[PDB]
Design an enzyme around this catalytic site. Structure first.
Site, PDB file in Angstrom:
ATOM      1  N   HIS A  62      40.478  76.839  39.272  1.00 16.11           N
ATOM      2  CA  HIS A  62      39.603  76.292  40.331  1.00 16.11           C
ATOM      3  C   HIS A  62      38.893  77.440  41.050  1.00 16.11           C
ATOM      4  CE1 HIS A  62      41.716  72.488  39.764  1.00 16.11           C
ATOM      5  NE2 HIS A  62      42.882  73.147  40.008  1.00 16.11           N
ATOM      6  N   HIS A  92      40.990  83.777  48.323  1.00 17.71           N
ATOM      7  CA  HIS A  92      40.161  83.323  47.229  1.00 17.71           C
ATOM      8  C   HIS A  92      38.777  83.030  47.799  1.00 17.71           C
ATOM      9  CE1 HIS A  92      41.641  79.713  49.218  1.00 17.71           C
ATOM     10  NE2 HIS A  92      40.373  79.214  49.026  1.00 17.71           N
ATOM     11  N   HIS A  94      35.012  80.486  47.348  1.00 17.74           N
ATOM     12  CA  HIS A  94      34.251  79.394  46.768  1.00 17.74           C
ATOM     13  C   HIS A  94      32.788  79.882  46.653  1.00 17.74           C
ATOM     14  CE1 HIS A  94      37.563  76.571  47.883  1.00 17.74           C
ATOM     15  NE2 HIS A  94      37.774  77.496  48.783  1.00 17.74           N
ATOM     16  N   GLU A 104      31.643  76.364  51.807  1.00 16.19           N
ATOM     17  CA  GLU A 104      32.268  75.041  52.112  1.00 16.19           C
ATOM     18  C   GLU A 104      31.884  74.679  53.547  1.00 16.19           C
ATOM     19  OE1 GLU A 104      36.462  75.315  50.776  1.00 16.19           O
ATOM     20  OE2 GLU A 104      35.553  74.097  49.205  1.00 16.19           O
ATOM     21  N   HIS A 117      38.271  82.739  51.801  1.00 16.02           N
ATOM     22  CA  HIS A 117      39.355  82.116  52.584  1.00 16.02           C
ATOM     23  C   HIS A 117      40.585  83.018  52.472  1.00 16.02           C
ATOM     24  CE1 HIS A 117      37.389  77.957  52.162  1.00 16.02           C
ATOM     25  NE2 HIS A 117      36.898  78.660  53.143  1.00 16.02           N
ATOM     26  N   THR A 196      40.875  72.475  51.698  1.00 11.19           N
ATOM     27  CA  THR A 196      39.619  71.956  51.153  1.00 11.19           C
ATOM     28  C   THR A 196      39.773  71.581  49.696  1.00 11.19           C
ATOM     29  OG1 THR A 196      38.711  74.028  50.460  1.00 11.19           O
ATOM     30  CG2 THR A 196      38.267  73.363  52.765  1.00 11.19           C
ATOM     31  N   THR A 197      40.978  71.770  49.123  1.00 13.24           N
ATOM     32  CA  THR A 197      41.245  71.336  47.776  1.00 13.24           C
ATOM     33  C   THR A 197      42.413  70.362  47.812  1.00 13.24           C
ATOM     34  OG1 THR A 197      42.860  73.088  47.424  1.00 13.24           O
ATOM     35  CG2 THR A 197      40.619  73.602  46.760  1.00 13.24           C
TER      36      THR A 197
HETATM   37  C1  LIG Z   1      43.252  75.504  44.659  1.00 13.78           C
HETATM   38  O1  LIG Z   1      43.248  75.830  46.100  1.00 13.78           O
HETATM   39  C2  LIG Z   1      44.346  75.680  46.835  1.00 13.78           C
HETATM   40  O2  LIG Z   1      45.349  75.072  46.274  1.00 13.78           O
HETATM   41  C3  LIG Z   1      44.308  76.011  48.248  1.00 13.78           C
HETATM   42  C4  LIG Z   1      45.574  76.263  48.856  1.00 13.78           C
HETATM   43  C5  LIG Z   1      45.563  76.565  50.217  1.00 13.78           C
HETATM   44  C6  LIG Z   1      44.416  76.561  50.954  1.00 13.78           C
HETATM   45 CL1  LIG Z   1      44.556  76.781  52.638  1.00 13.78          CL
HETATM   46  C7  LIG Z   1      43.169  76.393  50.334  1.00 13.78           C
HETATM   47  S1  LIG Z   1      41.677  76.396  51.262  1.00 13.78           S
HETATM   48  N1  LIG Z   1      40.458  76.251  50.277  1.00 13.78           N
HETATM   49  O3  LIG Z   1      41.666  77.692  51.847  1.00 13.78           O
HETATM   50  O4  LIG Z   1      41.722  75.258  52.144  1.00 13.78           O
HETATM   51  C8  LIG Z   1      43.158  76.127  48.978  1.00 13.78           C
HETATM   52 ZN   LIG Z   2      39.382  77.835  49.958  1.00 16.19          ZN
END
Ligand SMILES: COC(=O)c1ccc(Cl)c(S(N)(=O)=O)c1
Ligand SMILES: [Zn+2]
Ligand code: NA
Length: 258
Positions: A62, A92, A94, A104, A117, A196-197
């Site tokens: 992802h 990570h 986006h 996002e 993030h 957000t995922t």
């Molecule tokens: C696959 O992305 C994730 O599983 C994931 C896990 C924790 C968080 Cl806090 C986030 S996010 N995008 O930062 O809300 C994303």
């Molecule tokens: Zn994220």
């Protein structure tokens, strides 16, 4: 038919597996800068990343995550709107298929090319998996990326991406310093929200920095060479891995500034 970012499994579909998608504190949101409330009682954010220990970088199908050793208080976020101490577990991004989309969160409906993030969990819950089941479990520091001059502290991440092109690949990734990803100012907006995922859990205090960082077109181009598919499968470029803005509902976004 697991969740993802295509026509048939992308954001508009996630509510069937994860009904909280239509919940009361979903993220991301559009940050309407004029209607954010300045809160003079909000404290400066404390980012203490001097002893951070990165360990590994992973393509999870992802995004890619740069993971940290979060078994001691080495890289912690505190202050700002938070009570208590949150340990960095991973970061990570986006990003988009084009420079005009990818973030996002939005700012007065403006989309950035990407969004970083840095994910932190509240130490009072002992680990990330318990923290996500709590309303104050996570604090995510969000930083926008615009395309312009290169970010030198990003280049170690971009250079390793060819080794983790496909889903499930990882690589050792030690001695990466996330201070090299921060803008000059720590001025921020904050609001209660969610992952957000999927599983979209409502456990996040979002802290979104006002100042973007600039990355080069070559740097973001390398993000777009990643693959959502595993090795030996048909190529689907990892692009447009962002959830659009969700309804604000009964929330106020607070500003630390102006
Ligand atoms: C696959 O992305 C994730 O599983 C994931 C896990 C924790 C968080 Cl806090 C986030 S996010 N995008 O930062 O809300 C994303
Ligand atoms: Zn994220
Ligand atoms: Na490379």
């Amino acid at each position: 038919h697991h969740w993802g970012y295509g026509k048939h499994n992308g954001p508009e579909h996630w509510h069937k597996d994860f009904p909280i998608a239509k919940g009361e504190r979903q993220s991301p949101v559009d940050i309407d800068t004029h209607t954010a409330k300045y809160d003079p009682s909000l404290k400066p954010l404390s980012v203490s990343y001097d002893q951070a220990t990165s360990l590994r970088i992973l393509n999870n199908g992802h995004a890619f995550n740069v993971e940290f050793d979060d078994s001691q208080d080495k890289a912690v976020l505190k202050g700002g709107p938070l009570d208590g101490t949150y340990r960095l577990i991973q970061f990570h991004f986006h990003w988009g298929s084009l420079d005009g989309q990818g973030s996002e969160h939005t700012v007065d409906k403006k989309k950035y090319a990407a969004e970083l993030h840095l994910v932190h969990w509240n130490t009072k819950y002992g680990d990330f998996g318990k923290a996500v089941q709590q309303p104050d479990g996570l604090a995510v520091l969000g930083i926008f990326l615009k395309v312009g001059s290169a970010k030198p502290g990003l280049q170690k991440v971009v250079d390793v991406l060819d080794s983790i092109k496909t889903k499930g690949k990882s690589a050792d990734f030690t001695n990466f310093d996330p201070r090299g990803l921060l803008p000059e100012s720590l001025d921020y907006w904050t609001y209660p929200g969610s992952l957000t995922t999927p599983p979209l859990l409502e456990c996040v205090t979002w802290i979104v920095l006002k100042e973007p960082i600039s990355v080069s077109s070559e740097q973001v181009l390398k993000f777009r060479k990643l693959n959502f598919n595993g090795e030996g499968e048909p190529e689907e470029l990892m692009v447009d891995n962002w959830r659009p803005a969700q309804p604000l509902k009964n929330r106020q976004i607070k500003a630390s500034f102006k």
